[PDB]
Amino acid sequence: YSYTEKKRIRKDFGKRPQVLDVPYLLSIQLDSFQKFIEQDPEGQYGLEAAFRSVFPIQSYSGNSELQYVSYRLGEPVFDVQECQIRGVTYSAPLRVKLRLVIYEREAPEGTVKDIKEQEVYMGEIPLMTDNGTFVINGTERVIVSQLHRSPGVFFDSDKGKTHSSGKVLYNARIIPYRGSWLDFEFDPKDNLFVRIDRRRKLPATIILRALNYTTEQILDLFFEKVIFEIRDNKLQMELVPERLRGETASFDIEANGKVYVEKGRRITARHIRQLEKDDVKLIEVPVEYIAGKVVAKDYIDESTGELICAANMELSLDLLAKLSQSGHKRIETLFTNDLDHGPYISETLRVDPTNDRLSALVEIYRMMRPGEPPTREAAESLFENLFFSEDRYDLSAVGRMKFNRSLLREEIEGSGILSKDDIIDVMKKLIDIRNGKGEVDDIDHLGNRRIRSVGEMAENQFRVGLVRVERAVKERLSLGDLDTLMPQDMINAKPISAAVKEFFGSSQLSQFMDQNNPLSEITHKRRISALGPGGLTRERAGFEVRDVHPTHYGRVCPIETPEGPNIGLINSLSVYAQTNEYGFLETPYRKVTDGVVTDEIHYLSAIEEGNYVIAQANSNLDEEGHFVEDLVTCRSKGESSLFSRDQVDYMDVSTQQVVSVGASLIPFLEHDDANRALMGANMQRQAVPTLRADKPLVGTGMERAVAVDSGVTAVAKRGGVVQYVDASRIVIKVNEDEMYPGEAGIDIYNLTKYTRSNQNTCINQMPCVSLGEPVERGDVLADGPSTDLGELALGQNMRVAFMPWNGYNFEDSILVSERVVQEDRFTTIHIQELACVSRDTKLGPEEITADIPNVGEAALSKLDESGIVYIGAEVTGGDILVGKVTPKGETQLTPEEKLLRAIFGEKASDVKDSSLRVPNGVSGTVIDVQVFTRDGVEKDKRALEIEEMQLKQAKKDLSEELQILEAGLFSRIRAVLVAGGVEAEKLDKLPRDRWLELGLTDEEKQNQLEQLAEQYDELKHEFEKKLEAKRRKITQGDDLAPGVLKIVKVYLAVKRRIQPGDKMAGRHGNKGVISKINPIEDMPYDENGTPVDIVLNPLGVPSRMNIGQILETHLGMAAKGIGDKINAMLKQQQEVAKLREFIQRAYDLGADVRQKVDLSTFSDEEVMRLAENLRKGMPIATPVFDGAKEAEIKELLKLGDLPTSGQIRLYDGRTGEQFERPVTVGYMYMLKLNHLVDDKMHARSTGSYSLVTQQPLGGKAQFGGQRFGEMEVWALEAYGAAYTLQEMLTVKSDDVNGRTKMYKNIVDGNHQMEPGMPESFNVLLKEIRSLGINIELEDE
Amino acid sequence: IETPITANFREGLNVLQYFISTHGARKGLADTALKTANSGYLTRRLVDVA
Amino acid sequence: VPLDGGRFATSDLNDLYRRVINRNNRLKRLLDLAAPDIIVRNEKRMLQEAVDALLDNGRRGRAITGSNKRPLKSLADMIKGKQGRFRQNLLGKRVDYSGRSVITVGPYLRLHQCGLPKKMALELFKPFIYGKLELRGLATTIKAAKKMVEREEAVVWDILDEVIREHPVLLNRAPTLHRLGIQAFEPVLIEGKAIQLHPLVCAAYNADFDGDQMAVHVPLTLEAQLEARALMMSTNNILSPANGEPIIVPS
Amino acid sequence: RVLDATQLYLGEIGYSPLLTAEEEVYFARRALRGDVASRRRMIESNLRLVVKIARRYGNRGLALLDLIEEGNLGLIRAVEKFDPERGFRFSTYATWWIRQTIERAIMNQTRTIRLPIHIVKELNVYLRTARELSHKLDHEPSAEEIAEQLDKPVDDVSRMLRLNERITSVDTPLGGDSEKALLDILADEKENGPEDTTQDDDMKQSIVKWLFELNAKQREVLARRFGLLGYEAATLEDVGREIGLTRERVRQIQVEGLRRLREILQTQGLNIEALFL
DNA sequence: TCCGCGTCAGACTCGTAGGATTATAGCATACGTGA
DNA sequence: CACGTATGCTATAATGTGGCAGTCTGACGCGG
């Protein structure tokens, strides 16, 4: 165990030892974008692919061409730190090397004529952070991975297009990555059709004719052959015994010597073996049997040379006699069967109105380009371009892979284009399914739903940049002069830059990161959606897509999805789930070798899961051996049942792989309905981090994993002793073993201090380590905003009691103590950012001075001379943060204003007022202010005072960097020098600037002194340019929008307290509004005295069926009971041995506890730092499904000297008399949701008005009245209340006469109805007249 | 399903018992969101005639 | 009209209009030149495409897409269906003297009562404060009364408290299923941003205190005060109109 | 058959003369001397050339059909002014016209807010200068970086970059969810709500009372000057036209009316209360 | 008359956030209103 | 006259167009 773990250990009730440790939760995002930038040498991926795909581009003549060489990423212009602040993309320069090669025309190919070569910029790509975020215009944003239909082939059937026929019409469809669609479909008459792009319906033999296939070849491909011999006089026929199977003997079937079946009799399997063993080959048959049979190949009269009967024509008695005497006594016909080998292509050819190959390419061309007269080349070029050109078509790797394994093929990897083989093979399996063998695929299987992460999508959007450049290259090359024109004159850098920022902004997948909680960040990066482009739509979305599919097992979470119309589409990834190398999902599974459950793990694809039988994690291992029980509950083929030992092939690794991150944090999830579990995990993401991070007493263990992997905390890169602790930063000295021999070895971690969130909340990093503490590699050094000793801390736990209270907990309503409010524990932080813009209007430029017309000295008190409020100044709604003034033009001073400005005076300057003032209602403390100015107009004096600090603070910060880096660099040289020339004080006489002067003997360590000497100089020279970059970027004028001159951004800091209307919940979906903050006098309390924090309603439990909250309460109480015992011994100041015995007795209690922590190993000092953190309550871990049960919880309650029941004797605070009978009391880890009432309440009397509708605006954002919709209207119609409605149609909304007139009447007291007629109707009159319709108001 | 869920919420569901519970849970809550528009559209249809 | 950000914004009609006028003026030009008929044909086909796109864009063929690859909103579209004038900007309206907020329980209230926040009712009854103020002679004019309210001075709360007494307010919850989806009460001013609702009428709204919000509306006219007290008062509405059965029943 | 206006016209040009060198001269020579039929032919013939020229000038302002129509007008002006006597071909001379007429008609009907050629012409060079700079600076050039390469004014560059902004349509949806457009948000400038309407009504009614509270000869030269009761807002010197006919006595009596009225605002409860306003 | 293709509908309030790219050559002669 | 806005002309030969859409559904009419 580690040091940071030694400070506080979580008691784990797990009994299934983790063979696989939880992976880095942010794997997909980082690995995906890594592929995109990765310049792979050959195996093209990301950009390298995009260039090789499009390039080389050649002119339309084909005499000049542009060729891709190599590309590179320059380091970012502005780093994350700067980018987040300024407000522009965190992107890197794209420099690609291009080569313009031109050929000789009359000469063959004079390739060596002018091999021009240079490097060119095109577009700046937003880079990804180490958190998996993109900084777009100063916003860390996340691109959600998409879930879409995997390319290749797919067989479906509308189970009743025409329920008229009620015929299951089967259809096939070839889905490429790029290219046109190719569908095959039957019809009521089982005629095969082909519909490219689902355009016109064309006979399915027309596409085969286009691939040069004669009527004969077509038939020869699908149908089998039936041989007819006319020997002497008796007509005869070849019989494969396995043909007249399940049919009726229409004639008398007799052989060389025996009559097998009689006329009108079913030929059974007996009769088939009877014939097959007799080795029957030939049978004499009647001529009436052929009438109906279809002739196969063409048959010309040997004599004349004319077709007696063309291929694919139903024979007759007279045609057969015409063929017997022509001189053909060997006839070939089709093996037609209405049951098995079906005749479809045959009946289809009879519909097919085409003739040869060239004519088949006509109707294909007349479908897609109707109206243009077709030529040999236009018809051929089109068809060849569709599915048979390296340009238009691309199945890709996944496309060809799925396409092949769908056809049970030979190849995994093959060609991007459809071959002839592929098409007919697809028609063949469509016809297989139609016959009976073969099953259709379904889309809901994840084996068909591929996952597409950012890097592949960034690649796609980067291609369109190259495609849009392809246009400008070719056209400029051909007509433009060859020599003069340079390659960068033909390239444009905007189409690529614009097409990529289109993705990093407008796309549905690029959305603002939800970062109001470590869990929100990590679960929102692990979000997977089916929506946006190339996916589905709420309008288009079905049910079976949304429904949980048994493939989800281990891959996707069954309980993680919004309860909004985007319910089943959006989904989080499972805990141990990972992406298949091709795209599908895969889940870890313990291989079983010869019965022995081996520790070797194999990530099985969505496809191979169905194959093997998979035991559940509930199954018991025999401590290195096999399943303890002979029978094991397992699952396969998407079903579940019991199996024998040898039959088990694989097993679930952990018991938590079914669920996601969101769900792995819910304790006793096993005792919670999926409906409430979903809501609980959805609200756990909305948990605003509190003032003081409180650890959860009732956790799962996943706590630390989330907090650490979220990238919100600061974990140690290298272990050693913390040389320096600070609120702003941490300095750690590395140990010798880990420390590199070249550098000094002293890591720097400047912790992110209080600043804004995307949801306007606090972000802080407090040091969770003491000055001079020995820390191990990979240990949490600073905690985040919602983390505590590295473990996740979303909300706060408190003593809760389930019982009604005078209906203040009616429908889930919450009754919280004032004592919770006194500790300010659920009091939250909200950092709000407001801005002041100096624009350039038509009249003139605006500026920022303290000189503001029409103002009180009271307003300009908190401002300085420059016109910006002081840092630390309290502000309230109405007070001005930043003084601004704009130009005032021709202004008609109304007589009453000209007289009023002439009486009291103050002839306001020709400069309008628009100072940024605190919004009416907000009030906080200004924590910082940032000033952005264009490179030009002279600055404010305050903008100079802020430049003073940035500079002189950066000069200090860099001085401190080179100073401590020097001390760590000479610290090494000092140890190197002792090895060899051992002299202590005599060496430390003169100063340290003359230490590189001293050396050693010819040795490895002499080379080391030279490394450190010239690396000390390397840092000494580096320090100047580090200072240059800082100094310039502080002097640099920040580029702004056109019209803007300068901006001043203010940061307020609001401390909102909990109050009635605030929404809180547990993690079991148990919602509730705080109704009343009860006095400490009135709160119920136990016999011993300590009161309850929250009083919840017990009726929010049976109907809900989320008993996990009650177990959370009971365990929380037990856990606290143990903390209360430890708290008492630490207060009593007892002993190390006494605490050791009790705590060892606590850690070891569970049946088979996973963690077996011996305290004899812990030193006395290590025990007391542990007990000191255990006194608030022994933190417990209840794995998701392998959690604690009653036997364990009630046993823990006996250790805490708590009741076995969990119900305590409560006394009413109001009164003092006991309640009639016991109530459950314990500690439930509840949360403070983002839905706070200060951000909800709204009111309006009269305000803004809409632009045309002339009704009020909408929302408290814009100060708009509530909408009274038609449903709201019918309610008043029902009442009969006519004026109350007419009042809400006219004076309260449009009626321009009414609204102002009524206002004046109300202040008069005369609340009198004065209607006229809403504007929005007078609009509708003219709007219908604008449509050319006479709509006038006919009078009385 | 031929084999139903034996356990209750006090005793605790195993891993599948929950996976099975999901199928019914999500489809029940899918018809809370999507099927509501047919019934609210009926209210609209009825009103206009009446 | 111009944005605050120096940008402008135009309706798609203006854009569709410029397509009609340009093609129509180009036809005038080609009829001046006596151009060949083949060209005149295209111009007439174009003119009709533009006219038909102006009246009803998405109908005859592909709707003319514009800037954000989306179709231009035509005339017919502003009269058409939900998003048309009728359903969206004529039968349904945003309304003044209206506020909404999280509701919480009111177990102390009687049936004819409901908690109304002070700062809510303050803004809601703004013209009624200015009115009662001129009567007492505390405000000489209305911008004087405006500032009296803004400063939130002590004696203004007592005037607001005066007008609200014997004054009903409408409480709506979404969705408005049946008429009882709105009921009127006598407001009780409470310090806090939460509305406090009567437990027994929770059934009519289907209002669960799990984070519900209810819209408030002030009946302005005396007729609306009478209508609210007579028809829409919670005490006058007991039984459901659907079934002759009490919907005001404990739970 | 064919019901796309595009393919219909493109069909009719596909059945129109394809002229030889000496053919062009034969028709063109008669076309200048006005053969009527000749001017029709040369035009009909070279509609095919206009389409291939409008294949590269698309996706910039108008649609493909719009470009062709305008491009045809360039071929016509080329036919109005061609020289057959010159040994040089026609297809060469007509291309200069068809490329010009298209670019020019795109410069007008591309932008909603009409921009004359002169402000546009210049803007182009500023933008095409940005290309060169962008590729070598690998940074989208500033208004300054463009001004330093042309050695031209700063406000000019900024003034030319202020007329190249895009326009978001009022009916455009908001955030991957057509919940509300900008019209349901963007406010009406002209009409301020009843509170602002009644402000002026109540303020200006209070003044009508304050004018009837002063002296008869004190509210006769005070209002008739400011134009409160009178018809025209006169000055101290111009009040002499009425009956005053004074310069000193008008200025003493104007201010005497205002001094007695300042005490009427101190007593009613405004003065410094209504000074902020 | 059936097939088929088209047109028409698809709950009510609340929220969040602002917003995007391109490109039309150099030059001279010309027509329109204020000074 | 001038500043802003417009119309104008140039000569190798060149002469038929073409990036997405993803398929929704149960119902009720309207030409072949």
Ligand SMILES: Nc1ncnc2c1ncn2[C@@H]1O[C@H](COP(=O)(O)OP(=O)(O)OP(=O)(O)O)[C@@H](O)[C@H]1O
């Ligand atoms: N999309 C929605 N639109 C409208 N109302 C909704 C929507 N989703 C949930 N609701 C409402 O929210 C409430 C959620 O269930 P609620 O807790 O109120 O159940 P209930 O009727 O009180 O029954 P129980 O006492 O068994 O919980 C219901 O009243 C439901 O109608």
